Chains A and B, each alone.
Chain A
Amino acid sequence: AEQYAGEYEAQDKELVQLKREARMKGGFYVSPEAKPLFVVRIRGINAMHPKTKKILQLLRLRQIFNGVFLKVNKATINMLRRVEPYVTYGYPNLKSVRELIYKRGYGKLNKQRIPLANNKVIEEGLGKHNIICIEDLVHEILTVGPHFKEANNFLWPFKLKAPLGGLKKKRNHYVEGGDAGNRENYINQLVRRMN
Chain B
Amino acid sequence: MGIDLVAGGRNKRTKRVAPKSDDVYLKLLVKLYRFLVRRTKSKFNAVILKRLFMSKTNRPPLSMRRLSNFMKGKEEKNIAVVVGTITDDMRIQEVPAMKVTALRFTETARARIINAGGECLTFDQLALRAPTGENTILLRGPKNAREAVRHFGKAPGVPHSHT
Q: Is B22's CB within 8 Å of the partner chain A?
A: no
Q: Is B24's CB within 8 Å of the partner chain A?
A: no
| Residues of chain B contacted by A53 (CB below 8 angstroms) | 3
Q: Count B interface residues, CB 8 Å.
A: 5
Q: Is A63's CB within 8 Å of the partner chain B?
A: yes
Q: Is A139's CB within 8 Å of the partner chain B?
A: no
| Residues of chain B contacted by A121 (CB below 8 angstroms) | none
| Residues of chain B contacted by A57 (CB below 8 angstroms) | 4
Q: Is B158's CB within 8 Å of the partner chain A?
A: no
Q: What CA separation (Å) do A63 and B5 show in the bound complex?
A: 8
| Residues of chain A contacted by B3 (CB below 8 angstroms) | 45, 53
Residues of B1-20 whose CB lies within 8 A of A = 1-5
Residues of A49-68 whose CB lies within 8 A of B = 53, 56-57, 62-63
Chain B at the A interface: mostly helix, strand, loop or mixed? loop
Q: What CA separation (Å) do A45 and B6 show in the bound complex?
A: 13
Q: What CA separation (Å) do A53 and B5 show in the bound complex?
A: 13
Q: What CA separation (Å) do A62 and B1 show in the bound complex?
A: 8
| Residues of chain B contacted by A45 (CB below 8 angstroms) | 2-4
Q: What CA separation (Å) do A57 and B3 show in the bound complex?
A: 9
Shortest CB distance B5–A (Å): 5
Residues of B107-146 whose CB lies within 8 A of A = none
Shortest CB distance A123–B (Å): 21
B5 (CB) vs chain A CBs: closest residue: A62
Q: What CA separation (Å) do A47 and B24 show in the bound complex?
A: 55
| Residues of chain A contacted by B1 (CB below 8 angstroms) | 62-63
Q: What CA separation (Å) do A63 and B1 show in the bound complex?
A: 7
Q: A53-B3, A62-B5 are in contact. List 11 more A-B contacts (CB 8 A).
A: A45-B2, A45-B3, A45-B4, A56-B4, A57-B4, A62-B1, A62-B2, A62-B4, A63-B1, A63-B2, A63-B5
Which residues of A line the B interface, CB within 8 A? 45, 53, 56-57, 62-63
Which residues of B line the A interface, CB within 8 A? 1-5
Could you name 13 residue pairs across A and B whose Cβ atoms are closer than 8 Å? A45-B2, A45-B3, A45-B4, A53-B3, A56-B4, A57-B4, A62-B1, A62-B2, A62-B4, A62-B5, A63-B1, A63-B2, A63-B5
